[PDB]
Design a binder for this molecule. Structure first.
Ligand code: CA
Ligand code: CA
Ligand code: ZN
Lengths: 522, 342, 340, 222
DNA sequence: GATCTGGCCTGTCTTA
């Protein structure tokens, strides 16, 4: 249209863009590992490698009904590092460092994996694929260099939870609970990861060959996938925490003092004890010895806490506590289902008439953030006939709001140090409140996230530095982009959509183009 | 020669292709479920019982001195004479292969309750690489027992294995390995009449001989109609192994072997070509030193099998065969048919 | 003064705000269902039945010479003494205001199986404009029964009704009509005391004087605190009317009036303000030319009612009130209230 | 980004487009019916108006909890005719007629309506909106002039089922089975249709007044 | 021949 009307070419044709795309995509820049990667080819021009990794699809072999596409891990890292050349150069120039330096840079990457749902199957010819979809992505977080006897932070992502910096790595169409296909697809990625975790990368950007070293961290995993891959049972068991090995009752009694002794090799040792049974014990004795391990781990994850799911669980629990408070359960320990239905309906109608909210089936994210206000406590107290319950809920919400900014800020030690310094006392008072004036519900039982919040938050803050910059919400934001791309930016074919969506979502997360769009700011 | 519908209970998802049914004095026991063992049964071994053409599963526990074994999807089952079985090879739920060998047994019995003794056995000498889709038998020669292993697929060697072909499989060497259960030692024997690696074959044993039927070869993508006669002998010194090709072969891979009576087995299932699934049966006869493979009656197949694409199953022991077909999914994931032949 | 829950059956959707519970010898009957009648009951008249605090609805048929009337939503219901009811006005499911009088009457019954007779009756002379939210009452004066009707609200006339305001409604002119049920003659009267129109009021009937109480005026958007009285006479010639204001009025919009005892009428709350909900109840006791009002002991209201914004209901006849509360997304919680 | 990089205004800002929009939307061009429309105003600057048509929302009367927006039928047809003036002129030129002709045109239309399920509700303030949706649209089919002693078509729709010619008229969020609300919303449109089924329109095309008469046909109803 | 045991079920809670 523009060419026919304006009689000239303000824009370029499609083939020019296609030819230009081949620079940002992986498999275009040379590189080499000084320690050769074990069981990994040194060729450096591979693009979109098939996801099945040459899996046997014969009729005698185990049946295959999934499709997958993905890149080479090391090539993806090289492409991501070459995409952020200007940023690293400007960081070195701004931090009073000569650009021609080629010190051993250190790179930290955050991994994430989630299982989507309700993805419609397509018609046509091919294997009968299921509807559940799973993806796997990473994100370059921070980079440092060893200058003298310090570690200068040459670059840090200003928005570690934005979809504009969550770069894709692999796509597939399979169930998250389907442990066979999941491992059959994710084995090469873990292999390459463990291989390159003992080497160093060198490449020449800006005319100078550099040196890189990687320190990976896996935190973008919801609790369910953590239980699955690390070799643990379901969440409804008695061994609740994935950081400490306390039971349900001991976590409903103490609530305060819990350190962490749960490494990755420890899980392997636990599984080996569970398999070999050297002490010839019974079922219960051996289960108590292994602290509930019945599966060989295959992914090394970081023992951290997902902030988003923690907020969702806390909001749901609170909502249930409001329901119970309205019905006066502490006064009448008996109640029919219809009474519960009427109580929930009354609470929903009141929140609709006083907080501009609507009834929802599953706990949302915005509903969580908006439900946690003092005015919400006021609106709920507008229904309770008692008056001491009012003050109890006020103190409860005050303690929770005092504890919230610790595990939600990008840097608590520089934004809200008072909350961090006063976190232990607040948590102890919260636990005491729950134990004393909430006996009707928390007598002998406690969920996962209350234990996580009241047990291990200070240790994680003082060890890893911050919580919230390591959540899994970036992958969830990218799920939207995946849906939109698969619906509107791919070949509508059963055996062509995966590679197209992968390429498009890779191109969308290239900071090289993000700089062209911010020209107005110059 | 009957085909019967079977109604399954609630945990129908716990059955997957590649399982291995094991029999113990008229009682069939399930093994090799899908995924890691859940909290409904911390062991995995289930009791196989069919009553009024209805299927129900029942968990079971192990003894104190047992060794909790991981599920395997392509083991090498083998009977033995108290009474006990042998498990070797297979694929872990983590898609890894296990070189360990297992010896199941019965520990106690009280009111239809059975306790097992899963004991890991150490293998020393010419240990084979972790395999699957193979078979193993036991021969009796002058009051002595010896295990015969042959075939099996495996991944690439440690060096040539790359993450771009991480799941590529290759047929193992045609070497024949004798496994001794007493010392836990093996020995590598090579044979001149063995040139192509074979997998998913059928091993029929006798007093001191084992027979090979059909299979698949990745090196050529051919289903040969071979018939090998391995006569293992156990003298007072080093054992002896000899091979001999015989006419009258069958071109079938992944077949089901059952025993209606002594010296006569029944073969059904498998595949003739890539998409031409085998439909006719086959009757064998074990004489003194001869064998006779012949055709029998073709059971009346329903309209589901005739237009299906894949099937799986194993032997039950009492002349019956457990057979399943892939169902729908949205519904029941699989269907299951029992076959009677006696 | 005692609340109690009601467990309704499956056909809860057939109940809508604006129904009418007509009574016939203890057998309370339903009318005015939502939407047009389906094939489960082509008549749309249901037989109310409350047993063990549970509600059921069953169909009912008409006679061989009846007239299938459309289900209205805001008619004017009044008893008559040959016990029969009078239906006037209403709002059809197509928003078409009917201006025809229907008469309900039981013509046959045999073991809980009734048969109505819905006759058709038009009017002559000063016919009323089709409207709703009004009331009609019968009056006995000198061995003669005459029907008194008061104005309500209706759409714009056929001239100024524009499409951009096709659903605008204003209060009708405050006139007083006399309807002869035997002949169908309606005569228009004008009263100087009735200054402005009124709708959703409460009309208390007695021997020869109708008592208007409360209501809502759409013109001034004010809920007055006045009560009126209309005495009439039926001589051998032209009739005569009267209207005088009275002290001690009540400000209620869309109340629910029932009878506890002879010459002892209790009234429940209606709408006090726009967003404020009336809660306290009053008691009307009469003498011969006097009135009486008094704030009674309010029943123990439930928490869901104390915060609900909309509520409706009607009379049951046997000193019992059937009211409802809107739910969400089953859809209407129904409560019952008994007086003495 | 284009203006920042190139330095030349190839595209105009958002306000220019917002100003240019006021030419295509209805209620912009003057017109006049032969026999004045019954119960219809004469304002020719009536854009998007509330679909409730002045329905009372007091707590006393029948509770309504649906929102609606719609144009006015006659202004909608005027805008539609303004949109396709070039096509009508080209059709007149093709059939060997004169551009200065003003004979009584005949425009047949096709109405349609359907209910849409699975329309989620948002948070915030306002009435309780149900989780449904109902649309209402029309489409011109064939324009015919009476020349000489017979008729001849001028502009027929080449793609009758294309989405590019489905002009929306009314939009509301209500159940397709809520008969009361449905009639309360659709009664003004039906009144306008009945009033317009016996009138003629005077409209200026290229600077010359033209005559229009309509034939309504509703078939897009399941 | 009542008397516990075993397994079968069944509602609830815990992650999604
Ligand atoms: Ca998910
Ligand atoms: Ca539809
Ligand atoms: Zn813990």
């Amino acid at each position: 249209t523009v060419k026919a009307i304006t009689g000239r070419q303000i824009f370029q044709p499609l083939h020019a863009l296609r030819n230009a795309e081949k620079v940002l995509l992986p498999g275009y820049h040379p590189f080499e590992w000084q320690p050769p990667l074990k069981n990994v080819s040194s060729r450096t021009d591979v693009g979109i490698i098939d996801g099945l990794s040459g899996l046997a699809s014969s009729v005698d072999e185990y049946p295959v009904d999934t499709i997958a596409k993905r890149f080479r891990y090391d090539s993806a890292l090289v492409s991501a590092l070459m995409d952020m050349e200007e940023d690293i150069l400007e960081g070195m120039r701004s931090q009073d460092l000569d650009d021609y330096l080629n010190g051993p840079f250190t790179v930290v990457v955050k991994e994430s994996c989630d299982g989507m749902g309700d993805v419609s199957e397509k018609h046509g010819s091919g294997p009968a694929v299921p509807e559940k979809a799973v993806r796997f992505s990473f994100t370059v977080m921070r980079i440092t260099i060893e200058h003298g006897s310090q570690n200068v932070k040459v670059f840090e992502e200003p928005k570690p939870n934005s979809e504009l910096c969550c770069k894709p790595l692999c796509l597939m169409l399979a169930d998250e609970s389907d442990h066979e296909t999941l491992t059959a697809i994710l084995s090469p990625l873990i292999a390459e990861r463990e291989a390159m975790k003992s080497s160093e990368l060198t490449l020449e950007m800006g005319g100078i060959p550099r040196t890189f070293k990687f320190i990976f961290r896996g935190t973008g995993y919801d609790e369910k996938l953590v239980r699955e891959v690390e070799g643990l049972e379901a969440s409804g068991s008695v061994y609740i925490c994935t950081l400490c090995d306390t039971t349900r009752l001991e976590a409903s009694q103490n609530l305060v003092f819990h350190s962490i002794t749960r490494s990755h090799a420890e899980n392997l040792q636990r599984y080996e004890v569970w398999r070999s049974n050297p002490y010839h014990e019974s079922v219960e004795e051996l289960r108590d010895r292994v602290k509930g391990v019945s599966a060989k781990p295959f992914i090394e994850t970081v023992p951290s806490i997902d902030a988003l799911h923690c907020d969702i669980g806390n909001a749901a629990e609170f909502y249930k506590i409001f329901q119970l408070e309205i019905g006066e359960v502490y006064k009448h320990p008996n109640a029919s289902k219809e009474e519960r239905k009427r109580w929930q309906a009354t609470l929903d109608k009141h929140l609709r008439k006083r907080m501009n909210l609507k009834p929802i089936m599953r706990m949302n994210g915005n509903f969580a953030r908006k439900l946690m206000t003092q005015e919400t406590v006021d609106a709920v107290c507008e229904l309770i006939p008692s008056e001491e319950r009012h003050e109890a809920l006020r103190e409860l919400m005050d303690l929770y709001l005092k504890m919230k900014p610790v595990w939600r800020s990008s840097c608590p030690a520089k934004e809200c140090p008072e909350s961090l310094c006063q976190y232990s006392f607040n948590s102890q008072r919260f636990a005491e409140l729950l134990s004393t004036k909430f006996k009707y519900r928390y007598e002998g039982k406690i969920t996962n996230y209350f234990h996580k919040t009241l047990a291990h938050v200070p240790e994680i803050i003082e060890r890893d530095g911050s919580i919230g910059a390591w959540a899994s919400e970036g992958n969830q934001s990218g799920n939207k982009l995946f849906r939109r791309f698969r619906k509107m930016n791919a070949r509508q074919s059963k055996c062509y959509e995966m590679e197209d969506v992968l390429k498009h979502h890779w191109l969308y997360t290239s900071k090289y183009l993000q700089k062209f769009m911010n020209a107005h700011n110059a | 020669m009957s085909l019967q519908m079977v109604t399954v209970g609630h945990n129908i998802a716990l059955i997957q292709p590649g399982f291995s049914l094991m029999n113990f004095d008229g009682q069939v026991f399930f093994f090799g479920q899908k995924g890691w063992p859940k909290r409904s049964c911390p062991t995995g071994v289930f009791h196989f019982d069919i009553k009024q053409n209805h299927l129900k599963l029942k968990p079971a526990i192990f003894s104190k001195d047992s060794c909790y074994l991981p599920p395997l999807r392509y083991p090498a089952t083998c009977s033995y004479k108290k009474h006990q079985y042998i498990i070797h090879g297979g694929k872990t739920p983590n898609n890894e292969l296990s070189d360990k060998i297992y010896i199941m047994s019965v520990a106690c019995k009280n009111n239809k309750k059975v306790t097992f003794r899963c004991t890991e056995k150490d293998l020393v000498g010419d240990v084979p690489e972790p395999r699957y889709g193979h078979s193993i038998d036991v021969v009796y020669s002058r009051g002595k027992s010896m295990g015969v292993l042959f075939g099996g697929r495996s991944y690439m060697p440690s060096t040539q294995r790359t993450t771009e072909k991480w799941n590529s499989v290759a047929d193992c060497l045609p070497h024949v390995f004798l496994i001794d259960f007493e010392f836990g030692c093996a020995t590598s024997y090579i044979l001149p009449e063995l040139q192509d690696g074979l997998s998913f074959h059928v091993s029929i044993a006798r007093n001191d001989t084992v027979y090979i039927l059909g299979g698949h070869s990745l090196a050529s993508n051919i289903r040969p109609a071979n018939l090998y006669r391995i006569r293992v002998d156990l003298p007072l010194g080093t054992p002896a192994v000899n091979c001999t090709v015989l006419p009258g072969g069958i071109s079938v891979s992944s077949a089901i072997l059952t025993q209606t009576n002594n010296d006569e087995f029944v073969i059904v299932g498998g595949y003739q070509l890539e998409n031409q699934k085998r439909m006719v049966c086959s009757l064998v006869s074990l004489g003194d030193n001869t064998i006779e493979i012949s055709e029998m009656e073709t059971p009346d197949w329903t309209s589901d099998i005739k237009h299906s694409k894949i099937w799986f199953g194993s032997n039950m022991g009492n002349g019956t065969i457990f057979l399943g077909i892939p169902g729908d999914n949205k519904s029941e994931a699989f269907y299951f048919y029992t076959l009677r032949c006696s």
